[PDB]
C-alpha cells in the first residue's frame, strides 16, 4: 500500500501550485485514484515497449515514447 | 478497388439473412482503411526504434497489443497467431 | 492457390502485402506480417458486423444502416474507446435525458 | 499573532508558483511505481525513467487542478470539491 | 355562447418531446442553401473564383453539425453543474476553455 | 451577411438534439461566432490542400484530410 | 561510441542573437528535443503530402506546403520568406 505515500501535504502543495485557495477534505482519495490510473496506463505502455525490446531494464526513452503515444511529449530526457 | 466483396463474404458468415446499405459499406471501407493505417504506422515506428529493416509478425503483434484495448487485443492476438500457424502448418 | 486459402482467412493477404510494400513503412516485410494483419482486420470487421446485425434485428430491419452502426459502436465499452474521435455521417447520437430535467 | 485564514494560503500560492522544484517525495513515488509495475515481474529501471514519470505526473496533476479551480469558481465556490474534478475529467474527455 | 379552447401545455413538456423527437432521428438540421452560401462567402477570402463539390459541402455540414452537437452536450453538463436549467454563454465559454479551445 | 442564414430555430434544433431544455437569448450569436471560427479553420486547410494539388475545384477528400488534420476523423466520404 | 547532436549549431545561433549569453545543459537538451520534434513533424507531413499526390520525390514545394499547414499566423509567413531567400541564394 504505497499509494498512501502521496501525502496530504504533497497534494496540498500541488494544488497551491495549481492556484487553489481552499481544499475540501475529500480531494485526496480522488487525486490518488487519478494518479494511479495515469501511472498505470503509462507504465503499461512502457513495459510493453521494454518487453518488445528484449530488455530487463526499463529505459527513459521508453517512458518518453509512451508519453508521446498518449500525447504528452515530455522534453528534457532525450 | 475496395473491400466491399470481402465485407459481404464476412457479413454472410455471421448473419446469413441480412443486407447492408452502400453507405454502411463505405463506412466499413473507411474503418478498415483507418485501422490498417494505424497499425502499419505503429509497426513502422517500432521497427525504427530498434533499427531493424524488416517489419515482422512480432512487430505487428506489438503494435496490436499497444493499440487495441485488452479483451479485444487478446482475441486479436489469438486469431492472428492461429492464422499464422495455419499458414505454415 | 491463394494465400488466404492456405491461411483460412477471408480478407486478401496479397493486397495487404502489396500495400505494405508500397506504403513506405520500412525496407523489408516478413512473410507473416500480412497474414496476421489480415486476421486482425477480419476479426474486427466480424465483431463490428455482428454488433451491427444485432442492432438491426432489434429494430425489425434486414439492412444495416449507418444509424445501426452508430448504435452498435457507441453501445459497446471497448469499441467506443477505439473509435472515440471518429464521426459517422448520418449517425446521430444516443438517446439520453439528464435526470434533473424530467418532472 | 495569527495570519487571517487564506492569507498564508495566498502566500503559499505565490511562493510555489514562483518555485520550480518537485513537490512529491522521491522515495514514496519510487516505491509506488515499483509496486504497481508488477505487468512483468522482476523489472529494472533507469533513474531518469522515474524522474520523467514524476515530472509528467506532477504536470498532469497541476493541469487537472487548474481546471478544477476553474470549475469551482464557475460554481461560485472557493472550495474545490470532487464533483469539480469529475466534471473536469468528463469535459476533458476521459 | 362561445368556443372554449381546452388547455395549454405546461412549459418544457413540448421541449422534452422535441428533444426525444430530434434524438431519435438522423438528418441534417441546418438549411442547406444558406450553409452553402456561407461556405462560399468565407472561402472567397482565401482564393477567388473557386469551385466546390456537393460531397465536399455535405462533409463540411456533417462535421459542423457533429461539432456543435458535442459542444452543446458538454455545455448542458456545465449548466447543470451550475445548478441552472437555462444555458448561458458563460457555460459555452467554460466548456471551450476546459476542452482546450 | 450570410451568417444570419443559420436561423434561430435551426440553432434551437441543434440544441434540442444535444439535450438542452431551455435556451438563453445570447446562445445564438455565440454559436454563430463559434461555427464561423471552426469553418474558417477547416476551409483554410482545405483550400491549402487544393492549392497544393494545383486544383481549382475543392474535392471532398480535401475536406476529409483537413478534418483528420484537425483531429476529427469522418467516415463516409471516402 | 560517438553520437550526433545539435549543440554547437544552437550555440552558434545564440552567439549571433545574444553576443553575451550562456545556456545551461538542460536547456541545450530541451532545444535538441524541440529541433528533433519540429523536424519530425515537418518531415512526416511532407511525406503524407507526397503520398497524396503520388510523387516519388519530396521537393521544396512539398516542404513549403507542410510548413504553411503546420505553423500558425505570421510565423509561417516569416518561415516561408526565410526558406525562399535561402533557396534563392543557394541556386546562384
Does the domain formed by C2-87 have CATH 1.10.20.10? yes
Report the residue of chain A nearest D79, measured CA to CA. Answer: A22
Alpha-carbon distance of B45 to A45, in angstroms, equals 14
Give me the residue spans of the domains in chain E. Answer: 6-101
Q: How far is C102 from chain E (nearest CA, A)?
A: 8
- Locate E74 and state its grid cell: 458538454
Closest-CA residue to B11 (of C49, G45, C21): C49
Closest-CA residue to A29 (of D85, B52, E95): D85
Which secondary structure element, helix H or strand E, spans residue C39, and what is its range?
A: helix C32-57
Q: How far is E18 from chain C (nearest CA, A)?
A: 12
Neighbours of D47 (CB within 10 A): 10
Number of residues in chain F: 78
Q: How far is CA D76 from CA D73, E88, G37, in A?
A: 5, 15, 41
Is the separation of the CB atoms in F50 and F59 below 8 Å?
Answer: yes
What backbone torsions phi and psi does residue C86 show, to the nearest 5 degrees?
-115, 130
Using CB atoms, list chains with 3+ pairs below 8 Å to chain A.
B, D, G
Is the separation of the CB atoms in A39 and A32 below 8 Å?
Answer: no
DSSP class of A3: G
Question: Do the chains F and C touch each other, judged by at least 3 C-beta pairs below 8 angstroms?
Answer: yes
At the fourth CATH level, the homologous superfamily of domain F8-70 is Histone, subunit A (1.10.20.10)
CB-side exposure of D49: number of CA atoms within 13 Å? 24
Residues 27-46 of E with CB under 8 A from F: 29-31, 33-35, 37-39, 41-43, 46
Q: Are strands E51-52 and F57-58 parallel, antiparallel or unpaired?
A: parallel
Alpha-carbon distance of G68 to G77, in angstroms, equals 8
3-state secondary structure of D88: helix
CA angle B27/B31/B34 to nearest 5° reads 135
Q: Do G34 and A75 touch (CB under 8 A)?
A: yes
Q: Which residues of F touch B (CB under 8 A)?
A: 73, 75-76, 78
Q: Which DSSP string corresponds to D18-86?
A: H--S--S-HHHHHHHHHHHT---SS-EE-HHHHHHHHHHHHHHHHHHHHHHHHHHHHTT-SEE-HHHHH
Burial of C65 (0-12, 13-18, 19+ CB in 10 A): buried
Name, in order, each residue with C-beta under 8 angstroms of A60's C-beta and a sequence gap of 6 or more: A77, A78, D46, D48, D49, D51, D52
Q: Which DSSP string corresponds to B56-89?
A: -HHHHHHHHHHHS-HHHHHHHHHHHHHHHHHHH-
DSSP class of A59: P
Is the separation of the CB atoms in D66 and D87 below 8 Å?
Answer: no
Name, in order, each residue with C-beta under 8 angstroms of B47's C-beta and a sequence gap of 6 or more: B53, B54, B55, B59, C25, C26
Number of residues in chain A: 78
Alpha-carbon distance of B44 to B63, in angstroms, equals 9
Alpha-carbon distance of D83 to D68, in angstroms, equals 9
Burial of C99 (0-12, 13-18, 19+ CB in 10 A): exposed
Q: Considering only CB atoms, which chain A residues are within 8 Å of B58? A: 52
Give me the residue spans of the domains in chain A. Answer: 8-70
Q: Considering only CB atoms, which chain B residues are within 8 Å of A49? A: 49
Q: Considering only CB atoms, which chain B residues are within 8 Å of C40? A: 35, 39, 60, 64, 76, 79-80
Alpha-carbon distance of F4 to E38, in angstroms, equals 9
Is the separation of the CB atoms in G52 and F68 below 8 Å?
Answer: no
Q: Considering only CB atoms, which chain C residues are within 8 Å of E62? A: 87, 89-90
Q: Considering only CB atoms, which chain F residues are within 8 Å of C101? A: 21
Closest-CA residue to D66 (of G26, E51, C44, E98): E98
Is the separation of the CB atoms in B74 and C49 below 8 Å?
Answer: no
How large is the C-alpha radius of gyration of chain C?
19
The residue behind cell 461566432 is F33
Which secondary structure element, helix H or strand E, spans residue G44, and what is its range?
A: helix G25-52
Name, in order, each residue with C-beta under 8 angstroms of E74's C-beta and a sequence gap of 6 or more: D91, E95, E99
**Residues facing F42 on adjacent strands:** none
CATH number, domain D1-94: 1.10.20.10
Alpha-carbon distance of C84 to A14, in angstroms, equals 31
Q: Which DSSP string corresponds to chain E?
A: --------PPTTHHHHHHHHHHHH-----S-HHHHHHHHHHHHTTTSSS-EE-HHHHHHHHHHHHHHHHHHHHHHHHHHHHTT-SEE-HHHHHHHHHHHT-
Alpha-carbon distance of G10 to E18, in angstroms, equals 62
CATH code, domain with G13:
1.10.20.10
Which of F6, F24, F58 is facing E56, going by the closest CB pair? F58
The residue behind cell 509478425 is B57
Q: How far is CA G77 from CA B61, C77, E42, in A?
A: 43, 45, 21
Alpha-carbon distance of B81 to A6, in angstroms, equals 42
Sign of the C-alpha dihedral, residues A55, A74, B53, B37?
positive
CA angle A46/A48/A50 to nearest 5° reads 70
Alpha-carbon distance of D46 to A71, in angstroms, equals 22
Angle separating helix axes C32-57 and B22-49, nearest 10 degrees? 150
Name, in order, each residue with C-beta under 8 angstroms of B63's C-beta and a sequence gap of 6 or more: B39, B42, B43, B46
Q: Considering only the C-alpha atoms of chain F, give the largest distance between any 2 of them, rounded to a whole number of Å.
A: 48
DSSP class of F58: E
Count Cβ neighbours within 10 Å for each residue of D59-91 and write b for 16 or more, e otherwise.
ebbbebbbbbbbbbebbeeeebbbbbbebbbeb
Sign of the C-alpha dihedral, residues C65, C69, C71, C72?
positive
Alpha-carbon distance of E61 to F14, in angstroms, equals 12
3-state secondary structure of A16: helix
Alpha-carbon distance of C48 to G91, in angstroms, equals 55
Q: How far is CA G84 from CA F54, G68, G79, in A?
A: 20, 13, 9
Alpha-carbon distance of E99 to G41, in angstroms, equals 24
Alpha-carbon distance of A56 to A38, in angstroms, equals 23
Alpha-carbon distance of E23 to C68, in angstroms, equals 14
Q: What share of chain F is helix, strand, coil (3-state, %, to 5)?
A: 65, 10, 25
Q: How far is CA G66 from CA B30, C46, E3, G62, G63, in A?
A: 25, 38, 72, 6, 5
CB pairs under 8 A between C and E: 35
- Locate B40 and state its grid cell: 502499419
Alpha-carbon distance of F57 to G55, in angstroms, equals 21
Neighbours of B88 (CB within 10 A): 10
Q: Which resolution, in Å, applies to this structure?
A: 3.1
Alpha-carbon distance of F47 to C36, in angstroms, equals 39
- Locate D45 and state its grid cell: 529501471
- Locate D79 and state its grid cell: 472550495
Name, in order, each residue with C-beta under 8 angstroms of D14's C-beta and a sequence gap of 6 or more: none
Which secondary structure element, helix H or strand E, spans residue G43, and what is its range?
A: helix G25-52
Q: How far is E69 from chain D (nearest CA, A)?
A: 14
Alpha-carbon distance of F78 to E62, in angstroms, equals 14
Closest-CA residue to E28 (of F13, D63, B52, C63): F13
CB-side exposure of G18: number of CA atoms within 13 Å? 7
Is the separation of the CB atoms in A69 and B63 below 8 Å?
Answer: no
What domain count does chain B have?
1
Alpha-carbon distance of B60 to C35, in angstroms, equals 10
**Residues facing C63 on adjacent strands:** B19
What backbone torsions phi and psi does residue A23 show, to the nearest 5 degrees?
-115, 130
CB-side exposure of G36: number of CA atoms within 13 Å? 16
CA angle D12/D17/D19 to nearest 5° reads 95
Which secondary structure element, helix H or strand E, spans residue C59, and what is its range?
A: none
Neighbours of B73 (CB within 10 A): 17
Name, in order, each residue with C-beta under 8 angstroms of E8's C-beta and a sequence gap of 6 or more: none
Closest-CA residue to C89 (of D40, F23, B24): B24
For chain C, the distance separating the N- and C-terminal CA atoms, rounded to the nearest angstrom, is 67
Sign of the C-alpha dihedral, residues A14, A15, A18, A21?
negative
Alpha-carbon distance of G28 to B57, in angstroms, equals 39
Which of A31, A50, A59 is facing D61, going by the closest CB pair? A31
Angle separating helix axes A27-53 and D26-36, nearest 10 degrees? 60
3-state secondary structure of A33: helix
Alpha-carbon distance of C88 to G77, in angstroms, equals 36
Alpha-carbon distance of B23 to C90, in angstroms, equals 9
The residue behind cell 459542423 is E64
Is the separation of the CB atoms in D71 and D84 below 8 Å?
Answer: yes
Alpha-carbon distance of C69 to B3, in angstroms, equals 17
Q: Which CATH architecture has domain E6-101?
A: Orthogonal Bundle (1.10)
Amino acid at each position: 500500500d504505497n499509494i498512501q505515500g502521496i501525502t496530504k501535504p504533497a497534494i496540498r502543495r500541488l494544488a497551491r501550485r495549481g492556484g487553489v485557495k481552499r481544499i475540501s477534505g475529500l480531494i485526496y482519495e480522488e487525486t490518488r485514484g487519478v494518479l494511479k490510473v495515469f501511472l498505470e496506463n503509462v507504465i503499461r505502455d512502457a513495459v510493453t515497449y521494454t518487453e518488445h525490446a528484449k530488455r530487463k531494464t526499463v529505459t527513459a526513452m521508453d517512458v518518453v515514447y509512451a508519453l508521446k503515444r498518449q500525447g504528452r511529449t515530455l522534453y528534457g530526457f532525450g | 478497388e475496395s473491400y466491399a466483396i470481402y465485407v459481404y463474404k464476412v457479413l454472410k458468415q455471421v448473419h446469413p439473412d441480412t443486407g447492408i446499405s452502400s453507405k454502411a459499406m463505405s463506412i466499413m471501407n473507411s474503418f478498415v482503411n483507418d485501422v490498417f493505417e494505424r497499425i502499419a504506422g505503429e509497426a513502422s515506428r517500432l521497427a525504427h526504434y530498434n533499427k531493424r529493416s524488416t517489419i515482422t509478425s512480432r512487430e505487428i503483434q506489438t503494435a496490436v497489443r499497444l493499440l487495441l484495448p485488452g479483451e479485444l487485443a487478446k482475441h486479436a492476438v489469438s486469431e492472428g497467431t492461429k492464422a499464422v500457424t495455419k499458414y505454415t502448418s | 492457390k491463394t494465400r488466404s486459402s492456405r491461411a483460412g482467412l477471408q480478407f486478401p493477404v496479397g493486397r495487404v502485402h502489396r500495400l505494405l510494400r508500397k506504403g513506405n513503412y520500412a525496407e523489408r516485410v516478413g512473410a507473416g506480417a500480412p497474414v496476421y494483419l489480415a486476421a486482425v482486420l477480419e476479426y474486427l470487421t466480424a465483431e463490428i458486423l455482428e454488433l451491427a446485425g444485432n442492432a438491426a434485428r432489434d429494430n425489425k430491419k434486414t439492412r444495416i444502416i449507418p444509424r445501426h452502426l452508430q448504435l452498435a459502436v457507441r453501445n459497446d465499452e471497448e469499441l467506443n474507446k477505439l473509435l472515440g474521435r471518429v464521426t459517422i455521417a448520418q449517425g446521430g447520437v444516443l438517446p439520453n435525458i439528464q435526470s434533473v430535467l424530467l418532472p | 499573532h495569527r495570519y487571517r485564514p487564506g492569507t498564508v494560503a495566498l502566500r503559499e500560492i505565490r511562493r510555489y508558483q514562483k518555485s520550480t522544484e518537485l513537490l512529491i517525495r522521491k522515495l514514496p513515488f519510487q516505491r509506488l511505481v515499483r509496486e504497481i509495475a508488477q505487468f512483468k515481474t522482476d523489472l529494472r529501471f533507469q533513474s531518469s525513467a522515474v524522474m520523467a514519470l514524476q515530472e509528467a505526473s506532477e504536470a498532469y496533476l497541476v493541469a487537472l487542478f487548474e481546471d478544477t479551480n476553474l470549475c469551482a469558481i464557475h460554481a461560485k465556490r472557493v472550495t474545490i470539491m470532487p464533483k469539480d474534478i469529475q466534471l473536469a475529467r468528463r469535459i476533458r474527455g476521459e
